[model samples]
Structures are given as C-alpha cells and as structure tokens.
Target chain A: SGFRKMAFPSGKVEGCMVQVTCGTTTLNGLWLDDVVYCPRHVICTSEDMLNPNYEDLLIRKSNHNFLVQAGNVQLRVIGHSMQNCVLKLKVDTANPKTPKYKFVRIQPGQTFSVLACYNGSPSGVYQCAMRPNFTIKGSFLNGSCGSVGFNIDYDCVSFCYMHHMELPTGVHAGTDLEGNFYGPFVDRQTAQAAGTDTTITVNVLAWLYAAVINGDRWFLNRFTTTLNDFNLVAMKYNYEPLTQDHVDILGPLSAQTGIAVLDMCASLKELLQNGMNGRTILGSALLEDEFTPFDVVRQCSGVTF
Target chain B: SGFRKMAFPSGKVEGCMVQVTCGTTTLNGLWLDDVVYCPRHVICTSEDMLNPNYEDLLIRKSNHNFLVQAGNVQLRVIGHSMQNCVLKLKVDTANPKTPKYKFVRIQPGQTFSVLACYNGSPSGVYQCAMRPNFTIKGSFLNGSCGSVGFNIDYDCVSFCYMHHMELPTGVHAGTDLEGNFYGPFVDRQTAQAAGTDTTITVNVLAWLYAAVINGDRWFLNRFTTTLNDFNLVAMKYNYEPLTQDHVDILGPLSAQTGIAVLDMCASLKELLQNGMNGRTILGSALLEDEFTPFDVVRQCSGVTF
Candidate 1:
C-alpha cells in the first residue's frame, strides 16, 4: 500500500483526522501525521473511500471552473464548482500568498466572485485554482480548476530594486578624529567608568531598531551623536570599564540595521527603475549606484577603531 | 454615366426603390437592379436626396460609440448607435461569427450590453462594427457607427490552435492512403461494401468536412485530405458515375475551407509570432488581401489537386 506522507515545517499541526489505507490495512492520524513505523501512507477519507460494492464514496466529485477578468486596476475571479469547494487566487505565480490568499466555499452550480489588487500598483497578472472543501488533492482528482494568464492594464509602480550600500576603504576616511570608527569616541575617563555591557548593548540595539523602522537617513546620521552622548557620559565617570570592543559591535549591528530599512526602498526605487531604459541607466551607472547603502557601508568599513 | 452598378450573387432582389442620376439623366430600380442599357447606377434614396436648394438631406449622420470591458471570463459590449442600426461583434477579428453573430438594433442614444464567452476559457479579443438595418449602404450615409479595437481579459480559452495534416511527397502521397486514401472508413464493411457513387462519394465528402472542421496539422493537410478522399471516391465509383470530377470540385471547396480556417489560425499564430521580439504587430499585412470568391477559387485551381 503506497501512500504519501504530508508534513508541515511550522505552525501547530491541528486539523481533521484522515484515514489511511492500503489493500486491507487501515491507519488513522492527524492531517499531517508522520509516524516512523507506518508505511508510506495515502490519506483517504469517507469522501474518497470505496464501499464493498465498489461505488465511489463521494457522490459528485468537485469540479472547479474559473474565469479571470481584468479591469483598469482590478482583477476579478468568477469561480464555479461542486458544492462547498474552496477557491484560491493569486497575483503572478511567484508569490503564493501575496496580493491575496483567501478561500471561499461556493455551492454546487453556483458561482463566486473574488477581487484582488496591490495597494498602490494598479496593474498585474493573476491566476486562480479551486478544490473541494475537505481535502488536499490533485486538481484532476477533484476536477481542480484554473485560469489562464490574464493581464490588467492600469496605473502602477512599474519596477522595483533592492537598495544597498558598502563602506569605502581607508582608515582615517571613515573614523572620527580619535581613530575610533563610527563613533563619538568616549573620553578615556568615561570609557573606564561606564556601566556593564548589558546596558550598552541594550541602548545601542534600541537606537538601531528605531533608526531602521523610521527609515530616516537623518536618524541614521545621528548615530554619531548617540555615540557622542554615551561617550561623554562615560567620560564624566572616567574610563572605568567600557572598552573599544563595544564600538566594534556597532559595525556588525549597522550591517544588520539596513536589512529592514531597504524593505520600503522597493517602492521608492520603482519610480526610477520604471522611468528609464535599462541601457540608459547603465550608460550612467556610476552616479546611480552612489550613496546607496552598500556604497556607504563599503566606504565606511575601512575605518580602524 | 460614370456611376457603378451593384448586383447580388444570391437572394431575391427587392427593397426600397433607389434612383440613380448623372447630370440630367436618371434611372430607377431595386437595391441591386442591374441593366446593361443603363449607365453605371448610383444608389440614392429619399434620405440621401438633395433639397430644393441642393443641400443634402438627412443631417446628423449617426455615429456609433462602443465600449468593451472584461469580467471573469466574460466580455461585455456596451454599444450605442442611432435607431435601427445593426451592431455586429467578432472575436479575434478572424472569425466574423465566433462566440456569436446576431446584431442588435439599438435605439438612438441608448446603450445595450452583449456578453460572450466559451466554457472553461476566460479571455478573448474582440472587434465590432455597426451599420443601417437593411442593405449594403454607407455607414456615414445613415449615420452608422463603430468603435476602435477593445480588449477583454476574462475567462475563455486562453488560446486556440489550428490543426492540419498533409503529405509532403509527390501528388499521390498527398492523395489519401492509396485507393482507400481519405475514405471515411466507418468500419471494414462500410468501407468496402457501400454502393459506389453513393458510398464512395459520401465517405470522401464526409472525411473532407471533418478534416476542415478539425483544423489540425496544416492547410496542406486539408488539401491533401480533400484530394485523397475525392480520388478514392472517384476510383471506387469508376470516375464515369462521378462527373463532378471530385478532384476538380474539391479544389474550390478546399480553397474556401482553408480561407476561413487560416483566417483564425493567423490570429492565434500571431500571438506567438508577434510576441517575444517584435515590439508590435505590423499594422498592415499584404494590403488586407481583398478579392472575390471567384478569384480565390481560380487561384486555388493552380494547386496540384
């Protein structure tokens, strides 16, 4: 009895119990139950089980029919199928859960409509599929329905790119006057007197988190001021415990900071990417790549503490 | 005497009496009245008659307005025109009557909606035109109207293919399976025992019809099938009884069938042909290839069949 096992990598696995069988053997388990002793199992239920008389358990197999239409800025789904079938819609095939991900149970012989769109972009391609309510199975098995590639022509951000920067090489170029890279160098006395690593780490992490979330370059530029303030406080107390190691940790933290910051950069970059030809952009490539996060970071990396 | 005479190859010639005039000479007849003695006739009606002062009558020529929209596998036509103007719609431009063929006589200034689609396919391209209720008259003459091309992305076959099969070799390989060639062999008995002229002719003719409708392979396949079937029938019936010279007869029908079938194939083929590299489909192709049915049949005779 060959059967397929299903598993979920995340999320609490809780759902209806499914019956697995092969020939005369039968086993019962959770929807995605995986057991070591069990042979490869095929999930079968009352809906798909055959009776002694060899009649299909499910009286009418679910058949999905989908129609996709596009408007100036919207994509519409007209789905028809067996009673209580679930329909799923998506924009482009790349992202399974993007644009929209919802299921509707449509009664047999009846049709349901679903509409989807990006919040700011007006045009996109869409696809859809439908299946029976209680089962995860092949499209053909349940007459799964799908729609062809359809286009919606409307206004939208036309293209997008990732924003990145790298620190430039050279010791003095990126360092403050004291040769402390990325710093308001703590006064020697302050470094010796400041509190434990826990306090310093916590404060710096909080500041970086805020800068990333705010997505303000000005806030990022203020990194020096925060360092200066902390260093001044330590100076007032004398360099009791703090050391240059704390400053080195900031470099790694800065690298992680922009990861979240560039998420919104996609929207902004679309304006430029869609406006000009790729060839034109390449012809004047150096200027376009300047000031990006990657460029900035590469220039800053060479500074010695 | 520089007017043009009009005639219909079929249908009863009857309608509003139209007057034709040149300088002081004048003639009166039905819509398609043809007379050898008469000068080329121009069709003029009361609506087109000049007033006493020589100003043209029937001002405010009706102009048509059309809007097309798509929703979930259905194409909607919103058409506006003068009273009694017939509106015609076509899908993919190739088929004059695909999805539908009826024209609606919409009242002046009023809009009407027409919906069309094929099961399981959710998108189609459409074109339309409008004209007066009766006769082949000028659209502007009666204020007829139409709209520019509109696209509907919805549910319908995403695409269609023309299937045709043909033999590449000498005239006979093009001919159907030797003697049996293109016979509609229902069964061994029917293929061999059926009465000549009756059985042979019927089988061959039926096969040709099916090949035309199936639209598989290439136009050459159809030509070969028609030739083979006719030749097979002629042989079975002893060419004596089949005077239409089935091969000769097939040339005209084959040409006509290919004409209509190829029209649609061009549109479907264009999707792949025009896409990928070309920025756009060439607006003009061979001056639209205008010609009469006789011209087509005559040109078709040069074909080997």
Candidate 2:
C-alpha cells in the first residue's frame, strides 16, 4: 500500500529530464503528460527503477535459499554453505506470535540474501546525488559470528551521502574533521562569474574536465565503490578524511583520495545542476532533493567533506 | 502515529517475566493483572523502555545537534569537529518537492547526529532474543568520503543475531560457513537425558558456567562488542566465523571467537529457555518472538553455527 511504481506505458513518462525546478532547484523528471510526477525529489524512468529492475544491484542467488524483505528493499548475505544453517525471521504485528512461514530451514546449497531498498531503489543508488540530503551516515552488518572474509561494509562505498552546496558555502571549501582548513567554498558558476582563482574552485573546474562531464559508471565505481584510498576514506562515515587523526589512522593515501572523491561528487553535482548526464551505481539518473547541500555543508566546515 | 510506547503507569504493568507460552512456547510477559500482555514475544519493563530511558544507550550530543528517525531507533554519529559540517535529510510523502525545513546551514561548532528508531526501540536491542528473526543482516555507512579511523561498524558488536533452537537444531551442533563439523545438535537437557558424550553440547554447557547465567554485561561486551576476534567475526555478517575460508581470511583468532560467540548465543538461548537472565547492549531483556529457531537451523547443518 506504501509504494508508487513507475508507469512506462505513457509515452511522455520515459526519457529522463534534467533539472526541472518547482520551488528550490531540483533535478526532477519522469512526469506523466497529465502533470503527475515521481514523489521523490529527482525523477526518472530508468529500467533499474522499473518494477523488479533494482534487484540487479544485489547478488545472484545460486542453487540455494534464504531471503528476507524490509519494505521494497531486499538483502542477500551468503557465506560458505546453506547445508549447515537454519534461517529464522520475525515481523511484529498486534498479535505478536511466531508464524510458521517466518521460520524455515534452508536445505544445503542455499544462500541468505536480501535486496534492501532505500528511499525506493534496492541499492539506494538513485539518491546518491542527493548530496547533504542523503541521511544514511552510519551502517553495520546485521548478524554475529559471520565470516570476516566477506565483510560487506564495502556495500557502503557506492551509497555514501554526497554533500554539495551553492553560494559561498560550497564543497571542500573548508577544514577537515581533524581540524585543518581546506579553504572557502565556491561553485564553478559562482567562481567563473567573478573570476575567483581559488584552490576549491580550481579543483571544482578540474573535476568537470578531469572526470565529471564525460565520466561513466566505471569512473564513479573507481573512486566511490572499489577499495582504495577513496573507498577507505568513504568508510570514515561523517568526518573528512584529511584530518590529522584520520590521516594518521588511515594513512596519507586516504586523505588525498578523500579530497578527490569530494571534488568528484561536487563536479557530478555541478553537472547535475547543468544536466542529469550521469547515473548512480544503480543506473538511475535521479538525485533525492530533501535538503540543500549548503545547509548541510556549512556546518561541516573543516570537520567533514 | 506508528509506534507502541511502553506503558509504565498502572501498578501491575511492570515487573518483567521469564517464559510464557501461548503457541509453540515463547518468552513473553509485561502483562497487566487481568489478562493484557506485550505484543512482541518476550516482555519486560526495563527503565530503558520506561518512557525515555532507551535514549540512554546512544551517544550524548554535546552542544551540537543533528538527528533523524525511521521508526523508534536512534542513531548518533559525531565527527572530529562540529564547526565544519552541515546536516541535510529528506522524507518522502505524496508530495514531491523541497521543504524549507529539510535543508539548512550549520554554523561553526555544530555536529551532525541522529537518533534512528528500529522495530520499536532506539537500538533494536529489545528484540535480540528473536535470533534468526533479527533481519538486519547487512549494514553500511550512510555517508561518503568521511574518515575511516572512526568506523561505526563496531556499533554492531553488542548486537548480533544469536540463533538457537530445540529438537536437534541446537546451537553449534554443526559445521561453519566454510565447512568443518563441530558435531550434531544436542541440547543440555537432551544430552543429559541420554548421557550423550558430545563436543558441541560439552562447550554448550561450558558457557553456562563460564558466562551465560552468572555473567554480566562485561562478559558479553568482551565476546560480542569489544574489538577482538569476536567483533571481527561479527563483521562477517550472516555466516559462521569458524569456517576454513573465514579462518584463512580472518586468521585463527577470529575463527575461535566466532565459535565462542556461537556457543555464547546458544548458551544464552538455553538460559532464556529457563529464564531471561541477560540484557542486550540496549539494556532491555526482552527477546522478540518471531519464528522457531529449529525450523531455520535445520537447513544449516555444518555450514553455519
């Protein structure tokens, strides 16, 4: 009852559009010819959001069994074997008691998996460009005694909250979590308008030419998903990776990559501001518009990126 | 509007009970003198669930602020400096547009934090007893490009799904995620009945004397929460930690702790079968009643503990 499936039958409902502002600027589309539109901020008609397409972002269940659901989201976590484990699940209702269906033994050659949807998409990839409005700042694995060989914390790389802003409160225009000034915030448009020659702006322009404008999912995956300084720094959670304490704990490479990711996301936002030319890991070209990046970034001064 | 706050007004509405059966046996209580009882399996009236006590389990937000909600759980994440970061959040409804309140700038010294609710509590601690029913199989950090030094993954330690069952699907009575037989399932009661000499049940009974019944929070903190073999294995997500593949990836220490955690949870479950003698990291003693552990355990013979 709490869902809004995409309608692809309508001719005008398909081709994704760029920023279509209604109040504050937001990249919205997927509107029906009659004026109906997506309920989330940015909208689109990507096949990933098409009914069951979002499930593609998760794992493939082999000759096994074990799955659970939370809203439209599904999660799949598989380890060594299904032959040695039993799966149990519980959902609370007014009656509060065990239902036979919720508990079942997984025979051998089974897997435990889930496709957890965020906002609406399984991987929450559609909302990556939402910037500061992306509120998923912390996550942890669900069970105990699972094998460390398959730590899924990496699932967070493609889905971290990317924050950007307008006016003087721009991206990477400040200090980091450990206390060190990166400098003032200035958007490409704002900087170019006034001929402002600054580090933040210089990098802002660099990202546009270096990756953003023509960057594809592979580029995004490298810095935001794959394990590296960029991915490691993303693990920092809510603080900037360039801080002294963080650099010390995570090493120097992470700080540099952290700033790189910052510039990457900002450049991507700048592109979105111009056109929804890029796609999130989930293949959706929409960004959530719950809050302004500046509103969230200004508070993070030198503490976060 | 979608919540069930604990009621602590009536005189007979308190004192937690152990195990009460309605269907298939469950640990449930928190009943009034007449006939009313809690709706989710095991029941109790811990001060934590007493009005606003559950908040105590989370971090203390200093002079800074930033928070969000899901159901009833609370999540607080603070970085190096509050002076450098801004907070942004978004919730969806029938209307799809930016609300002025959703976005805002944070001044110097403001921190980004949250108190996310789950199931019905701030930490989902009240439902740990529900075992395999604990559906939070995987979690990832919510933000991108933060620092890696202070990964909140540790927050998952005190909270891991502890699975147990009866009728042969007992704890650790099998193998691990990789492949290695610990033995057959045999409960203390069942083993004692036949004087069955077994390895799984032997360790099963060891935990009772070493920890479980007389153990306090410190014991669980060491095995489940504190950073060590236990915590590392917990990061593995939904598989047993003692498998060869897991041991090869995580080392011998982690595998050992993995088995230890399995035995610990099973022991705790056994204790619960007798009496609710433990509290989750959230300080609540109530275990959710969602499904039969046996129905789920039988499938995972030697693949998971």
Candidate 3:
C-alpha cells in the first residue's frame, strides 16, 4: 500500500523490514555490516570497472619542446598482464583544433604497449582513443614517423628474452667458490669429504693464480721461502688439493685458502692502485727545546724559547 | 827513589789536600746523573743538594716563526729556588754571524720576569744563556724582532699583545638569571614574588628571550598552559606577565596574536614567500580510472568503405 493510504499508520512501512531486501522484495535474514540502498539511491562500488581507452589515459609531457618520437612513446600499467591491451596511432589533420585518438591491444605477458604516429598533422596536440570495460590502460600522442613506419611495435623485446633476463646471474656453481666460505680450502675439503685427509701441493702457479685472480699478496708472500720469493712450493700450489699430511700440518692455514688466495690478489691490486709506501711522510722538524721530547710535556718551558 | 839511576820512577804529589794547579789541570771524578757537569764531583745521597739552576734545563721549540722585539723582550724563568745558584739570561750578540744569548737572574718565589734586549744591533737572534759552567741543553732560535713569539717556560698560557694595551676586559660572572627561566605563573602574588613560580611569562618576547638568549625553545611550548593565546590577555593587561596559559587560549582566535607567535610567524612567512594556494602547492586530484567525457567524438561505425 502507499505510505499515505496505510490504515494502521504504523510509522514508515517502506523501510520497515528487519531483514535486508533484494530485487524489490524483502530477504529472509539480516547481515550486520551489509549496506541497503533504496531504489533511487546509487551505489558506486567498482563503478568504473571497465578497460581504460587510449583517450582516457593520462599523458605526461616531456619538458623539452622537441617533437614526440614513436619509439619514445611508452605505456606502463602496473598490477596486471598488459598483453591483452591494445594501442592505435593516428594524427589529426582536418580540424587542427582537435586531437586524434586511436586504439590497439597489447600482446599477453608484455609489460608495455607502443604505437608510432606518422603521416599526420604536424605541430598540433595529439591524443589516442581506447575502449574501457576491457580493463586496458595506456597513454599516447602523435609524433614524427620514421622510415620504419610509426605504427610498428618492433621496439618491444620478445617474451623469451624477457624470461631469460629475469633469471639470476650469480656465481653459484662451486662450493665455497661462491665467495661466502671463510676458512682454509683444505679444512673445507676435509669437512666436505667426511674426515678424509687431503694433500694440497704447494705450487708457484697456485700462488701466482691467487695473487692475480684473488689479489692475495700476503698469501703470495707467506708461501715464498723469502719475502717476495714467489718460487715456493706453497705459492705454486696454494689453491691445489691438500695432501693427507699437509692438511694435518696446516689445517688452519689451508682452511682459508680460498679467501686467502682471493684476498691476496685483491690486496695486491689495491696496493698497486693506491701506491702504498713503507715509510710515512713527516712534516717540518721541531727545534730541540720546542720538541715534546719526553712522553709528555709538563711545562711550556720544556718547549723552545 | 832518590838515586838518579834508580829503577822506580816518581810522580809529583805536592798538595796536602789543599793546593791549586796553575795550568789547565783536569779535575776528574765519578759521573752523576743529577749534575750537568762534575769537577771533582762529590757524592750526595739525596737530590736536596742539587741546584736546579745547574740542572741544564732542557727545552725544545714546538712552534714555528718566533720573533722578539728589542727593548721589550723579557726572558722569564720559573723554578724552585736554589741557595747560591742564580738563573741568568745571557745574550750571544758577541758573534755577528751566530745568534745572541741572554742571561737573566731568577729569584726564589718569582712567578715571572722580563729581560730587556737593548743591544741596538738591528735585533739579532737570541738564545737562552745559562752561566758559571755555561752549558746550554735547550736549543731554539729566538728572533730579535718579529711578530710571532715563543715561550721558554713550560705550562704557560703565553701570548703577545701590544705593550700599551689594557689588562683584558672583565671577569666572567657565573650567574643564572642572565638567562630566561620557563615555568607556570600560579597567581599575582607568585608573579610579584622574586623566587616564586609566577613571574615567568610566555609570549613571543618570552620565546625570543628563552630561545635566542637562554638557548631553549622546547621549554616555551611545553611549559605553557593555553598553548599560544596572546590576544585575550593583550586586551586587559598587555604589559603584565602574560604566561603561556594566557596566550594559548587567544592565539587562534586573534589574528594579531596568531601573527605574533614564533611558530605561526615562521609558517605564515614561509607561505607568503612561496604562494601557498597555487596548484604546485596543493597537488592535483587522483582518479580511479582516468577519463574525461568532454573529449567524446562522433565517428562512423566500422566504415570499411
């Protein structure tokens, strides 16, 4: 019955149901936080759930006055697969006052879509058209066309190239060789070999290799019989496998073989680059009396007159 | 032996513990670390017998470019008193090529002394000269006339100023009232009381006095009651002790009080300088789907013809 014609007149009966109503009819049960809107009221949740056309996309202009180029135009839409989205390129010529809008779809798994503008109106503002409801989002503008044509998408890399580029490219093949291991190589080998003793030849080639590749100058010096001898067996076989007896004698030394070898090379290279010197540079000399000759100067008179 | 051809050769023993040899007879004795030079040195058990003047005072030059003016020069020596020994400042101006040496006597309990250089030889270089034995242990060059000067005494706050200048300015007064103190004003009596809690006022002037002079801005806001109300209090007792409580209630409502407050003044000044209402200042609106219906255009429906 109409609200004005009700006989009992029990307040407003239009919204009297304790439970929610759906489809112009009352429902059975009520939910606490669920919203109820009358017929005339508009509910706007997800109201713009359509694909964004090229015309609706926002364009960010460059600071320079140079003409917009085809390859430079890029559409970046995050949080979704951009493969389905398309973009079209065109130039407005008839009405110089108005901009042209073109539309196209992007291939699947692609992060961006591009379109070149050519053979169209020059010097006028450019725009693009796109269809919504398809959930496509992008931006566009007119630009000069090259010999390769403005409506091309050759700038986008292939999916296979992108997949390969996403993979990690770090040194992870050898144990301890990845550079995280800190102890001697012999000790590491023994641990890995389950308590088996190993012999590592002390060779010059090993020391040279450590010095060159690992930059371990100190390790190069340690293996040499004399300072900078470079011909010692240890130097020759620094990174080589350790003998059973050799591991026992120098387990701790061998433990850091990799790091020692690597650091030696690094330190030597750094030393050469920085020009490390043995003696320190000193300033002007202090007069006999002015010098703080003692461990500490108690009085100013101890200094020179 | 009395006989001329006798086998034994005899040496001279002329004095009976009291004789003086005329020629350069060398006096020899056991070495003592306490004495600079020994002539028939006698052993002393304690350092009490040693003379500080003869201790060969060792001093070194710790600075560069020391100059001393003629006639105004003073060689000051400071040390414990000796019974017969005198600290002398001797000048070595006798040698034209070498620097001059000066000897000045230092008495017991003398904190400082000045030696005048009046030789009038165009201000030659001078070194400290010790007497009697004339053994110099300290070594330093003393320019006769130069701007910079060095001290021969130890533990001294030594500097050279114009001889005619006044004896410094004033003593540093160690008082706390030179700064502003932040607190609450309980009542009129408290404000009048010298040591009570009410005299402290909180305003722009108070903030300035506290922050600039007293070096504290944090105490102003935290100790005030009404935040920054200054105008209401201004209407009645403008010159009276208006505390933070009075200003806190009136600042926002009164334009004058708002502009006068420190924080407000800073913010308003910044906004005025930067032009706050511009689009650059406020930022543009954000949209869920970037679309503008104003750009709609009529076109043919899939016109392949």
Candidate 4:
C-alpha cells in the first residue's frame, strides 16, 4: 500500500519535520507534515563529532600570617594584580567571626596579596574565595585550584580606628592623645581657593587636603565630604598663629609650593583677643552659626576622589 | 551806648568761623549764641580752667616688628598696630613676574613672624593690603589677607625648585614619584568616603588639618582659590603619585600623632612637585581648568599642598 500523503497510520500528530533513524534491521521512514516547533536537547554522535576545552587556571596565595594578641581583627586587600579577574581562597573550616571565604578579583596570571590585620581574634574556621571575574560567575562555578595564602595569626593593632568609623577631629598617637585638632595636606590650588574665602581659608584647605594626601582616611573623609562646611568654619578660624620659631620651620616649607596654612593658633589668638569669644572647634556653630565641612558627611562616606 | 541789640557794622560775612590765635592765647569766655560750624578744623574752647594745655597727641608706635624673610631677603613693618593687615612679597624683582604675599592681622604688642624660601636672589618688592574691612587712618591693608598668611619673603638659589619652589601638599613626605598618590595620610572618616576609588584612598584630611595648624600659605591659596581642580591634579603629579605602598605607610602614620618619615617624604615630594608646576610657576591655571588636574604640570604641582 502507498504511504499516506499527509498523515501517519500510527495515529501520531503529523508535522513538517521528521526524525530519521537507520539500522540494518529497519527500512521504514517516518514523515511529519504539520508545521511545529519545540525545545530540545541534542546529543553528539560519532559521525557529527564535537568537543570543547579550556586552558588551565592557576591561583596563587599570599605568604603572610596574622598575629594579634589583643583586639578585634580584620583583613584588607593591600596589593593585588587581579584587577579584572575573580579569585577565591578558603580557610577550610567554618568560623562565624570570619567571612565564608575571601572573594576578590585577581586578574588572570597576576599576583594577589592582602593584609589581614585584627580588630580582635580568637581563631576559628575560615575560607578564602577564588574565582575569575566573580561578577560574571558564582564562586562555585569552578573547582578550587589550590594556590592561596593564609594568615591565621594575630589581630590588627588598635592604634588605628576601624574601617568606616567616624574619626574624631584631633591628633592621635597609638593609644595616646595629642592635639585636639588635626590638619590635612592639600594641593596649592585648593589651598589658595580655600584661602580666598573668609569661611574657608587656605589653612583649612591645606588641613583637609593634607588629611587625604597624608592618608588620614578618617580626616580626609571628613574634610572632602564636608568641603563646603569646612570652608564656612575656616572663615571664623584665625590664620597664622604660630610663634617665630614655629613659623620659621613651617613657613619656608609652605612657601615652597604656594601652600598656605591657616595657623589655627593664630586664628584662635585673633578671635580671643578681638573679643570674638567661643570655645568651639573649627566647624563648630558657636562662632557665627556657620556651616561646617562635616556636613558633607551626609552626602558622602568621606572618602575622596 | 551799651552793647545795643544792634547789628554788626560789617554785616556781610566772608571769612566766617575763622579764629586768629594771638600768642597762642586761650579763647576761654568767648561766647557765640548762634550756630558755628567749620571745615578743615573745628576748635572747641572751655572756660573752666585758667589754662587747658592741649594733649601732646603722643602717638605710640607698634612695640612689635612684623618681620618676614627668606634667607637674606626680609620684610619688616614697624608702626602702629594695623587691623586686618596683609603683606605681599614678590620673589622675582624683574618685571613680568607677579607678586605674592601672606595675610595677617597684627594686634597690639604682638609680633608677626614669617619665613620663606626663594628660587633666586631676592628681587621682589613687598606691599600690604586690607580687604572686607577698609583701612582706617591711612593704614596699610591687603585685601587677600582675609584668607592667606601675612608674612612672606623672597630669596634666590640654584636648587630653589627643590626647596623654596618645592613645597609638600602638607606635612607628609610621600611624593607622587613614590606612588604615594592618595596622601601622606588620612583619617577614618575620609577613608570611608573615598568609597572604593583607588586613586584617592589616602586620608587627605589629616594632611589638610596639619596645614591649618601650621599656617601653610600656599596650601590655603590653592585649595581655597582653586578648589578641587588643583588638589586633584596635585594628588597625581609626577612629583608624588599615589602608590599602594605609599598609601600603606601613610595609613598607619595618619592614625598616629607622632612624626613619621613617610609624612616628611610626602611633604618634600609635594614641595618639589609644586616648585615645578604650582601657581608660582604655572600661574592660576592649575586649578581653573577641569582637565588641568590631569595634566602633567598640574599633577606635578599637586605635590604641594
């Protein structure tokens, strides 16, 4: 009997596309006539050969250890070359105090080093994360490659404040007290601009810039974020209050780069002697209800650039 | 005829309110019922004492000398105390060179001292100014003094660029060349706000604060006058680029009050860099242009506060 033009005798729905299978024992052909589409998976066959492969991924760890006799502790990524790549390292065990693992971008074929200091530490299970382009792939996408350094020692000292903590405006020495105020280093341009205003003097600009350039993360954050407010307070702060000897050392150096320090002491002197009374910090409101650079805190985290 | 309520023989008046002194005699008992006003001088005589000696009108000169210098070059002001006095000192005496000076307020019995360095032998002139507040009684006043320092000097030297011209961003010493771009130091607040941007990770605030305390003139001028444009470029100048290692060194020192070599190095770096490109060399363009901060010259000047 002739094959039906558009239908199958087995009663299966007809479609335009048909699947073909051949074997020495079978000589029948199935035909589909109705148009149809569906999702499907394809398995490779020997005759239709296909194969995929990837290069070996290498991971390297740091060779430093952490040792903290006291205080809470944490780790910071100090130096690394894996800028665009993902990398992960593990401490193997689970420790609530530590993160599940250290995940970072260690560009392919680059060195990755981290500084692990302490706030406080008792030592427990820890793991490091290793991945390539962590943003694109999850940590578990690839298996561990074993090249990771671990520092399971002491905690970071308490000399410096913890990350993200608002720093007080004053001089500080490891566990000791110094001046009640602090100044930052800045470029001459900023110094000059700040100096042009009654509220924001060059001294204040220098103080704020100095904080950032000098690596006073806390102070820099306060000054840069609060630039406007700082300027306002600077207006009331006295300028050039140092003694001859004091000015001798600082003046020459300041002049070299066109930077001008406000000399808070001098400003204070003028304020007090001029009958401008007020026992307040540079950004305090006691002087003239002036705004302070500290207000920038609301707009930023205090980190510059 | 008694002094009749009569009109004067000379009714027409030409020289009115004119007094003729006879042997410096007193004008006591002289009566004048009608209104008497005088221009140029007004004399009021009393009838109480036989002889009222006019006060000698002794004027007291300022007991303190306002002296500012750089090497052999110096500026001295000896006179009555001037309020809101500002002094400008030029290093290059030759024409085509603009003059720069410091701002200061000289109070009664107080000596204002300023020291500066120069790139060449002293050739500039010195001037004083006053602003916002007008000068009283023909007193010297510098308008820019409202925000800058008051004492300044001019000197000349071979390595002036390294010393007099080169001023640090603040008290720190990490230069851009040393990869200490972020800062010689920063405070916690600033570090927090830098918000993951690697370029400005240091605590610039600490350095800026130091400038305030020390009365750094150039720093004040640049920051205040030029604002961030100058500082941003300065942070990346070849004289002192931000490097991870430099940042690390400043990070700890910023947290401490004691002096650190890193800080000194950063300061020197800034000074040297600014000497090469700050306003003293590049004029005011360092901070005026948005892209200038990214330029080599502007960045170089960024070293100075």
What is the C-alpha local distance difference test score of each model? 0.20, 0.21, 0.18, 0.20
Tens digit per residue, CA lDDT, model 3, B1-305: 00000000000000000111112221111101111111111111124223322333213111111111122332221221211221111222221222121222321111111111111111111111111121111111111111111122211212110000000110000000111111211111111222211111232232232222212222223222232343344323322344454445334323333334544333322322342232211011110011101011000000000
Candidate 2's residue-wise lDDT over A9-94, tens digit each?
A: 11011111111222222322111121211122111133333333212322332312222222233333232121111111121221
Residue A55 lDDT (model 4): 13
Per-residue lDDT over B1-305 for candidate 2, one digit per residue giving the tens place of the 0 to 100 score = 00111100110101111122222323221111222122221111233222322123223433123222212222222321111111111112211111111112221111111111111111100111112211111111111111000001111101111112122212112111111211332212243121222112222222232222222333343222222444243333221223333223322222434434344544334433443432331122332221112211211111110
> Going through the candidates in order, what is the number of backbone clashes in each?
54, 63, 98, 209
Q: Candidate 4 lDDT, tens digit per residue, B1-305?
A: 00000001010010111121112221101001111111100111223122322222112212122222222343232322211111111222222211232222332111111111111111111111111111110101111011111221221101100000011211111111111112222211122221211222222333332333233335333212122333454456422244445445444344443434344344434543553231321112121111111111211121110
Candidates in descending lDDT order: 2, 1, 4, 3
- For every prediction, compared with the true complex, DockQ reads 0.01, 0.01, 0.01, 0.01
TM-score of each: 0.14, 0.16, 0.11, 0.14
**Model 2 TM-score (2 dp):** 0.16
What is the lDDT, from 0 to 100, of the residue B75 in candidate 3? 20
Report the Cα lDDT for residue B106, model 3.
26
